Paper text:
In these mechanisms, the effectiveness of inactivation depends upon Fc gamma receptors (FcγRs) expressed at the surface of effector cells and the interaction of the extracellular domain of the FcγR with the Fc portion of the antibody bound to its cognate epitope. In contrast to humans, macaques only have one low affinity FcγRIII receptor, [name], which shares a polymorphism at position 158 with human FcγRIIIa with Ile158 and Val158 variants. The Mm FcγRIII forms an asymmetric complex with macaque IgG1 Fc with the Fc binding near the bend in the comma-shaped receptor; the majority of the receptor’s contact residues to the Fc reside on the C-terminal second immunoglobulin-like (d2) domain closer to the cell membrane.
In structural studies, we used receptor variants in which glycosylation sites at Asn38 and Asn169 (two of the five total) were removed by mutagenesis to aid in crystallization. The apo macaque FcγRIII(Ile158) receptor, expressed as Val158 variant, was crystallized in orthorhombic space group P212121 with cell dimensions a = 49.1 Å, b = 67.0 Å, and c = 69.7 Å. While one well-ordered glycan can be seen attached to Asn45 in the apo macaque receptor structure, no glycan is visible linked to Asn162 due to disorder. This added hydrogen bond may provide an explanation for the detrimental effect of removing this glycan on expression. Receptor crystals were grown from 25% PEG 3350 and 0.1 M HEPES pH 7.0.
Author numbering: 4 to 174
The structure:
Amino acid sequence: DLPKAVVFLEPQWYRVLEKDSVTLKCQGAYSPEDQSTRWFHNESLISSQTSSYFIAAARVNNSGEYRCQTSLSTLSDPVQLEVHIGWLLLQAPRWVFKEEESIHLRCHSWKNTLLHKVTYLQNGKGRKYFHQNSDFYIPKATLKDSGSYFCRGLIGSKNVSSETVQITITQ
Ligand SMILES: *[C@@H]1O[C@H](CO)[C@@H](O[C@@H]2O[C@H](CO)[C@@H](O[C@@H]3O[C@H](CO[C@H]4O[C@H](CO[C@H]5O[C@H](CO)[C@@H](O)[C@H](O)[C@@H]5O)[C@@H](O)[C@H](O[C@H]5O[C@H](CO)[C@@H](O)[C@H](O)[C@@H]5O)[C@@H]4O)[C@@H](O)[C@H](O[C@H]4O[C@H](CO)[C@@H](O)[C@H](O)[C@@H]4O)[C@@H]3O)[C@H](O)[C@H]2NC(C)=O)[C@H](O)[C@H]1NC(C)=O
């Protein structure tokens, strides 16, 4: 039993819109004579041989679980990627947080189209407003931060909203 390799998302958002870029990175030990990495998507080997797997323009079928293995590691745990269709997407680095952790939320527009007059909502109520698009940080989460979140804004002069994301805070 060798240590597990680990997959990381860069940037950290596990939910992305179609046409976003995503890099999966593998961390694991290599034997000197074998510097190659094996990648899996949906439990099937894929064609990347490098420690980074780059998705230049995400599509719905890039969704699923990824795993990787290096020559001196065991197969990593799966990391899930969700590719969504929409004009707006509420992004988070995960959906489960422990009390007192920081929560970084982002209202992301398709193709980074310019967005303004952004509201973040929790449980159907306005929670934070920004005249200009800005991320939303909860520096120290409490049980009061559990709920259904979404965001809304103006693209040009049309209102758009994102779908909701459940965020759960644990003890
Ligand atoms: C690896 O495994 C993973 C599984 O883990 C697999 O991922 C699945 O891949 C399949 C195949 O592509 C996916 O199925 C497709 O989903 C397409 C997108 O569906 C979402 O978006 C729809 C459109 O979005 C709306 O977005 C906003 C709304 O807020 C707004 O812009 C509009 O309303 C716009 O319409 C949306 O309608 C759809 O909602 C339905 O489905 C969800 C559940 O997914 C349900 O909750 C809703 O109530 C509603 O029923 C969904 O949110 C979808 O477009 C596509 O369907 C059309 O295209 C196919 C083309 O093949 C047609 O055949 C089909 O008849 C439709 O015309 C299809 O359904 C599936 O969702 C993935 N599963 C996930 C992500 O968990 C990967 O493919 C695997 N990869 C590999 C390489 O093996």
